[PDB]
Design a protein around this ligand. Sequence first.
Ligand SMILES: CC1(C)CCC(c2ccc(Cl)cc2)=C(CN2CCN(c3ccc(C(=O)NS(=O)(=O)c4ccc(N[C@H](CCN5CCOCC5)CSc5ccccc5)c(S(=O)(=O)C(F)(F)F)c4)cc3)CC2)C1
Length: 144
Amino acid sequence: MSQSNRELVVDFLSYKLSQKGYSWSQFIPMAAVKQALREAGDEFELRYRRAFSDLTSQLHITPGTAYQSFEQVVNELFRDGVNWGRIVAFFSFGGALCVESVDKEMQVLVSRIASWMATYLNDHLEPWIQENGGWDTFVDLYGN
Ligand SMILES: CC1(C)CCC(c2ccc(Cl)cc2)=C(CN2CCN(c3ccc(C(=O)NS(=O)(=O)c4ccc(N[C@H](CCN5CCOCC5)CSc5ccccc5)c(S(=O)(=O)C(F)(F)F)c4)cc3)CC2)C1
């Protein structure tokens, strides 16, 4: 549901901020989902470190331009459809935007980015997720 999805976003973003030595104080099957997502994001960031790195020096964020940048990238990422990989890449993108934000003393973006990710998950990705077995399938596929 929509609250679940909000939980996932906050867990993932806190995880990424913790890893990089920042504060996240701008904030059981569910535990299994969260664990699989953390690991998949790390794995994604490892295999696609080139793409990851290219994007993290590409855009310059301000509180005034953040939302249009977030939306362009997300629309590009899902232009041709949804799959699980693309969903993991979506979470990683969010994580990278938050980390960049805290770096540049734009802490206010962190919770805005969380809510933009939850909204997009709940409006645009959730239908595809329920159709494809829900988050249980994602956990089975990642660990099988
Ligand atoms: C246009 C633009 C610039 C826009 C913006 C932008 C962009 C740039 C930076 C950032 Cl930051 C964000 C976005 C791009 C850049 N990029 C390029 C990379 N892109 C993809 C590459 C491959 C797939 C794919 O393959 N999709 S997939 O077939 O569904 C699939 C396959 C395998 C696994 N999993 C394995 C797990 C193996 N482990 C072994 C160890 O032990 C445990 C299991 C591999 S890790 C793994 C592998 C792949 C994905 C995730 C994790 C999973 S998965 O983890 O989701 C699962 F399994 F389903 F859970 C799902 C999907 C997309 C998409 C976009 C382009």
